[PDB]
């Protein structure tokens with residue numbers, strides 16, 4: 011997915027083409043994976059922009075999830091939450107970033 | 122028209138009145154005045170004590186439980202998404218109370234977009250807390266105007282992980298790469314990078330807001346100004362009095 | 370802590386500077402109405418209400434009147450503030466970010482003498498943690514301790530002189546323990562996760578995995594964490610927190 | 620400080636007050652329908668209380 015900071019366009023992205031157009035945390039991480047497993051690769055953006063969900067009716071996965079199940083995508087590298095329902099349809103790696111629900115509030119500046 | 126006015130000025134300055142040869146007349150007024158100013162200054166001091174005390178009683182929230190204990194500050198999540206479903210499915214009494222609350226509270230705490238929620242927080246001036254994914258919260262906190270901040274520990278566990286189609290040969294070696302990058306800690310280097318090195322505010326900036334202290338100069342300094350000003354009036358009156366020493 | 374410095378707590382030192390200077394400023398003015406006897410007589414003003422040796426007001430008594438209102442407001446504010454200390458009696462934490470421990474030198478800090486953690490600092494490339502490592506290696510007597518129990522000992526003996534790193538859940542688990550003197554501060558330095566382990570190629574693997582995620586989403590894990598920790602806790606945090614309202618006077 | 624700390628204290632008027640405190644111990648008969656009522660209880664307050672007595 012196209013999400014900051016994990017994924018960002020170059021301000022002059024038109025000047026670049028291919029993977030260079032994108033930039034971010036996940037991008038560099040992808041470079042890391044490129045080092046450890048040695049591979050050429052192309053970054054690709056999901057169309058709907060959805061993380062992916064199986065509608066109960068058609069029972070068709072959409073989003074990146076569908077892109078994996080339907081062979082559209084070779085590998086997914088994104089802030090993709092692990093879930094049991096997604097666990098059985100695709101194979102996650104071990105988590106690389108613990109995280110959770112959190113409290114955002116105004117900063118208490120004195121006057 | 123001035124001399125005993127000056128004497129009353131010699132009364133407020135100290136307790137209240139004297140010189141009067143046993144009662145006489147208005148010395149009893151001196152007593153009543155003493156009683157008077159006594160009462161008022163007492164009440165004043167008590168009042169200021171009330172301000173500082175009530176001020177100290179207040180505490181910043183550091184757990185959602187604090188939200189459960191209050192109502193002055195509205196709180197909620199995105200109108201849709203896994204987050205609300207967490208509370209809805211939650212069986213913990215705190216989270217259950219919170220979910221029942223948000224379901225009951227009107228106007229509804231839910232917002233269409235995360236950005237809209239950020240606006241509802243920033244504009245409520247602390248009267249509306251919001252809840253969202255921790256990493257997202259940290260990523261926003263470094264954003265301008267740096268007016269908002271995350272507080273407390275994470276309510277629950279989740280973890281992003283690399284995804285591959287099942288049975289792919291890449292899977293295991295990639296996961297190995299994950300573990301390697303974790304053990305090396307380079308991932309954290311990246312974390313300090315994009316969340317801070319790219320950040321709009323410093324990591325140590327959060328510590329710039331001090332802590333408790335004890336009485337700033339400000340409030341009393343407001344009295345320092347009227348003090349020095351009173352001295353200036355005293356000087357002006359002094360010199361004009363010398364001018365009457367010349368004129369008269 | 371007492372030691373005179375405790376006495377000045379209600380009002381800030383800068384304000385003391387300003388009140389002294391304002392006072393001598395009051396003193397020097399008095400001579401003009403009439404300066405060694407001006408400072409003396411001003412001392413005769415502060416000593417009692419304020420001023421006297423002027424014809425009624427003239428342009429002198431007014432100074433002492435404003436002075437009187439002034440000192441009155443000061444003592445009033447003083448009393449209010451001190452009472453405010455005597456009310457809530459909140460207890461500030463010495464530190465926040467782990468970085469602060471690096472920034473200061475007043476309080477020693479260290480870890481278990483052997484284990485993965487020590488390596489984690491020894492192998493850390495982050496400048497903060499590096500500074501922490503060179504620190505912990507440099508200082509003697511060694512911050513390192515042979516056992517976690519030894520860390521408990523040095524901490525309980527520390528009386529705030531020393532701090533000790535360790536596994537988070539273990540730390541909180543100690544926090545539940547008596548005398549509940551212990552408390553954790555700051556977030557985790559680094560992500561980690563205990564997990565179920567199975568022999569390689571075991572058939573049980575995948576079902577175990579699905580079972581783990583299923584139990585996790587049901588909150589059963591968090592529920593049990595609420596159980597074996599806080600519910601079993603020797604010292605309830607808000608329980609012990611609700612109970613602290615004494616008095617008397619040193 | 621004396622008068623203030625004095626007024627802050629309040630008499631108990633709900634078991635919830637006990638649930639929120641610990642300084643004053645509380646309990647029931649060692650056996651009987653009441654204890655069963657607490658162990659069978661599903662209300663969060665009573666559940667907290669029974670949980671408290673369970674280990675105290």
Ligand SMILES: O=c1[nH]c2cc(C(F)(F)F)c(N3CCOCC3)cc2n(CP(=O)(O)O)c1=O
Nearest residue numbers: 013061089090091092201202203204235254257
């Ligand atoms: O795998 C998932 N990973 C997700 C990662 C993120 C982000 F934090 F942005 F990385 C978010 N957002 C939260 C902040 O607002 C923008 C979207 C949603 C995700 N969802 C959908 P959910 O059901 O709403 O959690 C997933 O399913």
